[PDB]
Design a protein around this ligand. Structure first.
Ligand SMILES: CCCCCCCCCCCCCCCC(=O)O
Lengths: 126, 272, 340, 213, 58
């Protein structure tokens, strides 16, 4: 189970950035996925999520309407598009996967202990 | 002879045509009730291996179903005995005991429902001994009191049933009346608590499910006093003869627990 | 930091080297080697005994070495030592903490262990000459809950924890001899080799590790699963082991090949494995499931050759006698049946 | 040698009586799991002569994924809530939608009722920053505002209540319900609220066994 | 981040040690498993039909 993320970097405020995660090892069409982040000197925060077929999507309020999520089952990749970024949206963005297939529950914000999570990518706004 | 002789204290006679229809209703309902209580008993016997079925509320239902089954079989055989002889007397004794056992078990069901719904806590306590005692032994004591004081008041009647011209018929109505009143009170309390947490169809379904087990449909037969209650006798017969059918429908076929247990059992059997 | 990035790249390079070595090792596959063996047919097993007496859900079970006495752990705080032949309870040990998730029967039959959310492994002396059964030792060194405990000998025990660490205790002194660190998630199951020198440990990181008891160090790491590993079980010869997970798959790994061989999964199974066990000859691979069933796989040809049904809730424990005569399954319906 | 066979039966009949005795103690007590957003803690309290048994797993890790399955026969889960609010909402999502906790009810406890009164007045950390929908939330007017608090606080509390109820009454399709409540740092009547909620839970479970409700 | 680099160093040492292990071909491991199963088949009560005379559970 490998989750490699990319697409980060330094972005001017009000800009745009598209993060992508490459998933290898598991049937991508059976697992609900997630996007988490960790601001410097803070804890892990849940940003968005997506269902098996992409029918159900939720956000964390502060990102509602500016961030969108999408998954491509054929290519085993998942995207998170960021629009109109703000300096407050600086963190290392991880692409966590929900623990079990065909499940609506997800305990995947554990304090630097979740096994099915990527190394993460740094997104800075300045 | 019909089913309405069970709880008629006044000596009223109906014109020809009502007797025939009432006897036909008694036969049809009683047969359709015994052939359906057999089903609701074999269902419990088969499904007893399931954990949910192994609680206390199925002891009461099983024993009540057995009591009603034997009582209705005995009444069906009792409709043809040439009254005024030893088989008539023994059948009268057995019918009295089994009908009082049925009413005692209906009271047991009422008390268990009261201890599960109204007095929410303390229901898990094991009261099997008390329930079995007050269901089976108490009818035996009432029969022993009825015997040796009104022994001649069993065979000496128009039909193979304890007489209504000597006052000995209240040995069946009075316990039945007490059971009906207590069950009506419990049912009113349960309807109130189910309507409180329902905020009309939900209450109606609850009353329909509770009608057969609590045995509140027998109040119709005791209301034939004035003499213009032929309709009341009809309702009593046709709604209390189908008690086994109602029990099987509402407590053996529309029950979610029983249906789920049967589904699990049939998926087990399909793998063989 | 530059050092951290370089070190991670180095680790990735060695991971790629290991993958290439394993790929070059796999000249053939077990599926295409075992096509000239007659199928076992249809295996029908019936519930010979149903063992009642538990109030809460049975969470663990272990057979004895004599294939007669088996111990059961329930969430109501009980440890009942049954007699399978006569369906007679022999002991009823009340536990200090009701939440017990494991139980181990000593090979000598003198001690039984238990543990759970209390974070403590407690050994019970069954012999207890001139007295009743009581706590012998209270092993407490784990920060997380105990998922599985197994007896190597009558004196030393091996336990798993929810703090991502396996331990090897010395019951006589009640102290940790070695600590088995190296996992990243909760360790959920152990299996001791027929020779008590090696043991494997499943975890919640979809990885099974091969540990050396004496050296206190890993030998191999097996990663072929997608989700948490719940059950683990050595082959009778000690050269392989099956591994159940929450992705409806129970694979088979080898120690000498150091890679998976055969995956035992079906499209109609969308539940998770909670128990994995092997027959005496290793041909049959019994597996528990969350669909209230238990499938009898064929270890050589990955086909279903039997279904064990009759549990209301999920099976949470499965065991095969050392004699290999009966199989016991415990579920969350407070029942415990024996199939043969 | 039938002496061993009869001694085994005697021991069986001796420990079966003890199991019967312990069955009443197990059934007459009600277990509760207390969690928020030596290694296990047990609190025993009784109200109106019924025994309760409260648990607080506070000596373990944050991966509450394998040991949360142990608490499926528990009658209720006490969820205490003090972006911690979003974490609490997701935790309640996972607890509600877990396929082993589909029949376990949850008794919420929204604390910091007096702490939010000064927080909203200060305005340093507006709730609208984390929840943009709060800018258009109106009180449903079926409320019980305590005289002494501005409408802002009695709207804020009902906002989190409505979020939790939106989570609750939307999915699951299970035999379980949620019971929101508001507490403070000075009241001591929360035990009565837990007692009433548990009474309701077992009441509904019994009614559904009779298939009335 | 000393803990992170220490953990990475431990993982690297583990990978270094694990990559140096002798591996036999799968065509040999499968043959060994098949031979073991064929040799022990005659003593497997679950697989072969167990007679009722020596069966202790019936
Ligand atoms: C302490 C009691 C626990 C439960 C005991 C078993 C209850 C379920 C079985 C009751 C019905 C048994 C079969 C009845 C058949 C009949 O009356 O003809």
């Amino acid at each position: 189970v490998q989750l490699q993320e990319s697409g980060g970097g330094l972005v001017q405020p009000g800009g745009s950035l598209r993060l992508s995660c490459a998933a290898s090892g598991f049937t991508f069409s059976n697992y609900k996925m997630n996007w988490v982040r960790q601001a410097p000197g803070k804890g892990l925060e849940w940003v968005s999520d997506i269902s098996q077929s992409g029918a159900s999507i939720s956000y964390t309020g502060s990102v509602k309407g500016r961030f969108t999520i999408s998954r491509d089952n054929a290519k085993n990749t998942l995207y998170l598009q960021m629009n109109s970024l703000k300096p407050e949206d600086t963190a290392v963005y991880y692409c966590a996967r929900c623990p079990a297939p065909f499940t609506r529950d997800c305990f995947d914000v554990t304090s630097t202990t979740y096994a099915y999570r990527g190394q993460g990518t740094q997104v800075t706004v300045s | 002879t019909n089913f309405a002789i069970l709880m008629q204290v006044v000596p009223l006679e109906l014109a020809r045509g009502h007797q025939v229809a009432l006897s036909s209703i008694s036969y049809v309902g009683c047969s359709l009730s015994v052939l359906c209580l057999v089903a609701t008993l074999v269902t419990f016997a088969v499904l007893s291996s399931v954990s949910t079925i192994r609680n206390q509320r199925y002891h009461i239902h099983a024993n009540l179903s057995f009591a009603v089954l034997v009582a209705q079989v005995l009444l069906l055989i009792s409709f043809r005995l040439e009254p005024g002889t030893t088989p008539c007397q023994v059948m009268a004794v057995l019918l009295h005991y089994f009908f009082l056992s049925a009413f005692a078990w209906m009271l047991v069901e009422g008390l268990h429902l009261y201890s599960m719904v109204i007095k929410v806590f303390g229901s898990e306590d094991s009261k099997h001994r008390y329930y079995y005692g007050m269901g089976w032994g108490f009818p035996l004591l009432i029969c022993i009191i009825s015997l040796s004081f009104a022994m001649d008041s069993y065979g000496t009647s128009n039909n193979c049933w304890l007489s209504l011209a000597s006052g000995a018929i209240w040995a069946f109505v009075a316990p039945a009346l007490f059971v009906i009143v207590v069950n009506i009170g419990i049912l009113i309390a349960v309807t109130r608590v189910i309507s409180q947490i329902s905020a009309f169809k939900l209450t109606a379904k609850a009353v329909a499910v509770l009608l057969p087990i609590l045995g509140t449909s027998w109040v119709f037969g005791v209301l034939a006093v004035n003499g213009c209650a032929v309709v009341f006798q009809y309702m009593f017969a046709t709604l209390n003869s189908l008690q086994g059918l109602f029990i099987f429908l509402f407590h053996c076929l529309l029950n979610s627990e029983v249906r789920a247990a049967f589904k699990h059992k049939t998926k087990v059997w399909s793998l063989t | 930091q530059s050092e951290l990035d370089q070190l991670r790249q180095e680790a990735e390079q060695l991971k790629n080297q290991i993958r290439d070595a394993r790929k070059a090792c796999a000249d053939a596959t077990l599926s295409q080697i075992t096509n000239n063996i007659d199928p076992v047919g249809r295996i029908q097993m019936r519930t010979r005994r149903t063992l009642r007496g538990h109030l809460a859900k049975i969470y663990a079970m272990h057979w004895g070495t004599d294939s007669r006495l088996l111990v059961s752990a329930s969430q109501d705080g009980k440890l009942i030592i049954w007699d399978s032949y006569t369906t007679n309870k022999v002991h009823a040990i009340p536990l200090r903490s009701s939440w017990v998730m494991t139980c181990a029967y000593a090979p000598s039959g003198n001690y039984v262990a238990c543990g759970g959310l209390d974070n403590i492994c407690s050994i019970y002396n069954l012999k207890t000459r001139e007295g009743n059964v009581r706590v012998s030792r209270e092993l407490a060194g784990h920060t997380g809950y105990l998922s599985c405990c197994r007896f190597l000998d009558d004196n030393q025990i091996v336990t798993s924890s929810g703090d991502t660490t396996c331990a090897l205790w010395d019951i006589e002194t009640g102290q940790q001899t070695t600590t088995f660190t190296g996992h990243t998630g909760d360790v959920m199951s152990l299996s001791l080799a027929p020779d008590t020198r090696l043991f494997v440990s499943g975890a919640c990181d979809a990885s099974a590790k091969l540990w050396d008891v004496r050296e206190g160090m890993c030998r191999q790491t097996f990663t072929g699963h997608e989700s948490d590993i719940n059950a683990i079980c050595f082959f009778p010869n000690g050269n392989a082991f099956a591994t159940g997970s929450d992705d409806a798959t129970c694979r088979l790994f080898d120690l000498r090949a150091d890679q998976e061989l055969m995956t035992y999964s079906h499209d109609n199974i969308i539940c998770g494995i909670t128990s994995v066990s092997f027959s005496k000859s290793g041909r049959l691979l019994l597996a528990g499931y969350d669909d209230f069933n238990c499938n009898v796989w064929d270890a050589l040809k990955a086909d279903r050759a039997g279904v064990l049904a009759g549990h209301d809730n999920r099976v949470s424990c499965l065991g095969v006698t050392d004699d290999g005569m009966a199989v016991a399954t415990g579920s969350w319906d407070s029942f415990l049946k024996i199939w043969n | 040698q039938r002496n061993e066979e009869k001694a085994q039966r005697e021991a069986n009949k001796k420990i079966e009586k003890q199991l019967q005795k312990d069955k009443q103690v197990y059934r007459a007590t009600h277990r509760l799991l207390l969690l928020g957003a030596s290694g296990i803690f047990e609190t025993k309290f009784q109200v109106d002569k019924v025994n309760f048994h409260m648990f607080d797993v506070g000596a373990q890790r944050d991966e509450r994924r394998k040991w949360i399955q142990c608490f499926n026969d528990v009658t209720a889960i006490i969820f205490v809530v003090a972006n911690r609010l979003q974490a609490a909402l997701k935790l309640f999502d996972s607890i509600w939608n877990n396929k082993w906790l589909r029949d376990t009810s949850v008794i919420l406890f929204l604390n910091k009722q007096d702490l939010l009164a000064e927080k909203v007045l200060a305005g340093k950390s507006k709730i609208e920053d984390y929840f943009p929908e709060f800018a258009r939330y109106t009180t449903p007017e079926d409320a019980t505002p305590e005289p002494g608090e501005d409408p802002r606080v009695t709207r804020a509390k009902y906002f989190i209540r409505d979020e939790f109820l939106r989570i609750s009454t939307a999915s699951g399709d299970g035999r379980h319900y949620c019971y929101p409540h508001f507490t403070c740092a000075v009241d001591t009547e929360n035990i009565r609220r837990v007692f009433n909620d548990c009474r309701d839970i077992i009441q509904r479970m019994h009614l559904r066994q009779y298939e009335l409700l | 981040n000393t803990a992170s680099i220490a953990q990475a160093r431990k993982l690297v040492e583990q990978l270094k040690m694990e990559a140096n292990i002798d591996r036999i071909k799968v065509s040999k491991a499968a043959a060994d498993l098949m031979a073991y199963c064929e040799a022990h088949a005659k003593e497997d009560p679950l697989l072969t039909p167990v007679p009722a005379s020596e069966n202790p559970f019936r």
